[PDB]
Design a protein around this ligand. Sequence first.
Ligand SMILES: CO[C@@H]1O[C@H](CO)[C@@H](O)[C@H](O[C@@H]2O[C@H](CO)[C@H](O)[C@H](OS(=O)(=O)O)[C@H]2O)[C@H]1NC(C)=O
Lengths: 133, 133
Amino acid sequence: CGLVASNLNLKPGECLRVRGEVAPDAKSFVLNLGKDSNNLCLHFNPRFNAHGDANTIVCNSKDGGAWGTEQREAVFPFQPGSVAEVCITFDQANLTVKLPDGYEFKFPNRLNLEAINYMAADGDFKIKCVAFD
Amino acid sequence: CGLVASNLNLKPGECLRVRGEVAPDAKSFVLNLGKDSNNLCLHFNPRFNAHGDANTIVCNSKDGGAWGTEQREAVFPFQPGSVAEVCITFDQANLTVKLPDGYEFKFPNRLNLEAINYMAADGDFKIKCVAFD
Ligand SMILES: CO[C@@H]1O[C@H](CO)[C@@H](O)[C@H](O[C@@H]2O[C@H](CO)[C@H](O)[C@H](OS(=O)(=O)O)[C@H]2O)[C@H]1NC(C)=O
């Protein structure tokens, strides 16, 4: 599928920066973060037009292989056929997803993991560089 | 095991840039490139103080879990307690490895892979940035 990375050992307060390019005719791309594939503290899925959603960011969690309750945001700062950088961090309370443009999204830390060791991109999103700063 | 990456889909003539921090007391580190843990087109192992070797870059291949013929490099452009970057590309003849001070050596591609989809880092070398030019 798309890029998968393990043993990131990302601790709270630390910054995970991902730069990638969006497909010209993109429907949906996702960035998954957590312990492994079945334990996602952050399912970041901007939907241009997929699953009945149009220009909407759908965030969710997964614990023990089971999806949590979807959270949906108002603004949709992503554009098809472009480069998008995302900076990700987390506390004991929230996952924080920042964009350079000034957009900042938050998602509740439902899994309360000690660290982020997993990252995947199952969508129309070709990762070009990943920084662990 | 350290940072492991899958589904890289690196085609011939495309660059893989890895920037990281060499530990102050670094003994050795490893960069594994190929299809999986059993199939490596490049085993890149700079040995500062490991296996009786000192300041020697050890290169090898792994095919079907079987190590190929080991090749060592004369020069050693790595200093412990510093930041080093490695740029790796290939064709179906050679792996090209570029080192932090302009040094450049080739390693035979003895697996003839259609693409590199697996990277595994280990040892005294914390990754900071992985790019895919
Ligand atoms: C009731 O079915 C579900 O409806 C919601 C509301 O539109 C859909 O969001 C949901 O689609 C799936 O959402 C999850 C995240 O909650 C994933 O993004 C999944 O994509 S993927 O991981 O397979 O790529 C969406 O298909 C939909 N279906 C399910 C299975 O919950």
